[PDB]
Design a protein around this ligand. Structure first.
Ligand SMILES: CN[C@@H]1C[C@H]2O[C@@](C)([C@@H]1OC)n1c3ccccc3c3c4c(c5c6c(n2c5c31)CCCC6)C(=O)N=C4
Length: 304
């Protein structure tokens, strides 16, 4: 039996928040950095406002509203915080601002400053995010480094719920389990597979999986028993763990709760598990106008 989902969908006034700079555009919608001054409360909240690609085809609204449905029903430090929606014309989704953006980009744009303590910490945090979705019986179906966002370089969060489904219910080829490519079976275990690939994107500083190999070939490669190569920086311990996420027997893959444990152990001696050139000596970052006196982060903004 299912418990009743008593999350709150918060409807926001367009006047309660001011935009400030475009962030993303084209591909689908149109994201903005902005601030959100709820009602009368004397707080300001860095937000991302995602108003979808103008022209408002009934198909598009029912699609972002599901995202918001899902995002409103999740609550975990490692899953992207949804603040509310706004019913304007085209429908604004309002989420917590992740100032550092896509984690796939972050790693590409910072290789030379990223060290094992960070890489292993991201691994744990995503494993936690995923374990939590599991707890709430959700299957993400689109885990990848492009779908993890960076709030600060020590703190990442899983995003993109535009494909999430409940387990038991009813295309990014290079991240998918094999049961998924062949029979569209998706399970929490098909999520572990893609975790495997996400981790590999991170350890190779954001390479592209099976660069070259075009998508039609993939199921065949995998069925023959080929997997992605061991990244240069990876000890066999780390790489062994990727490999197990890529087993064919789904039930032989590990569980997110185990990944948490394993990376967490490794995260206590980072340098034993990832061999990075110039590791010891590496520091990373920690946000515009001046009226930043009343700014609180969404993570510290809580609702009764
Ligand atoms: C390639 N990478 C892009 C950088 C960026 O535009 C994109 C389109 C891309 O990401 C994957 N994008 C989104 C696309 C679809 C849904 C949400 C976002 C998105 C968000 C945020 C983004 C930021 C930045 N993008 C943010 C966001 C760029 C740096 C500031 C933060 C953010 O804080 N919350 C959501």
């Amino acid at each position: 039996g299912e418990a009743p989902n008593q999350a709150l969908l918060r409807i926001l006034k367009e006047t309660e928040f001011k935009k400030i700079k475009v962030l993303g555009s084209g591909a689908f919608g149109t994201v903005y950095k902005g601030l959100w001054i709820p009602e009368g409360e004397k707080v300001k909240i860095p937000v991302a406002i995602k108003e979808l690609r103008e022209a408002t085809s009934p198909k598009a609204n029912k699609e972002i509203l599901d995202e918001a449905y899902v995002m409103a029903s999740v609550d975990n430090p490692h899953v992207c915080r949804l603040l509310g929606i706004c019913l304007t014309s085209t429908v604004q989704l309002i989420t917590q601002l992740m100032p550092f953006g896509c984690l796939l980009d972050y790693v590409r744009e910072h290789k030379d400053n990223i060290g094992s303590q960070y890489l292993l910490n991201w691994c744990v945090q995503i494993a936690k995010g995923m374990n939590y979705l599991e707890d709430r019986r959700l299957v993400h179906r689109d885990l990848a480094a492009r779908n993890v966002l960076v709030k600060t370089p020590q703190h990442v969060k899983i995003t993109d719920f535009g494909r999430a489904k409940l387990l038991g219910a009813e295309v990014p080829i290079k991240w998918m389990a094999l049961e998924s490519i062949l029979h569209r079976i998706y399970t929490h275990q098909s999520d572990v597979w893609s975790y495997g690939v996400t981790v590999w994107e991170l350890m190779t500083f954001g390479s592209k999986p099976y660069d070259g190999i075009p998508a039609s070939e993939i199921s065949s490669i995998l069925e023959k028993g080929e997997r992605l190569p061991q990244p240069p920086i990876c000890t066999i311990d780390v790489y062994m763990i990727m490999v197990k996420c890529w087993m064919i027997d789904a039930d032989s893959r590990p569980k997110f709760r185990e990944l948490i444990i394993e990376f967490s152990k490794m995260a206590r001696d980072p340098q034993r598990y990832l061999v990075i050139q110039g590791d010891e000596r590496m520091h990373l970052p920690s946000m515009d106008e001046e009226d930043m006196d009343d700014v609180v982060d969404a993570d510290e903004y809580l609702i009764p």
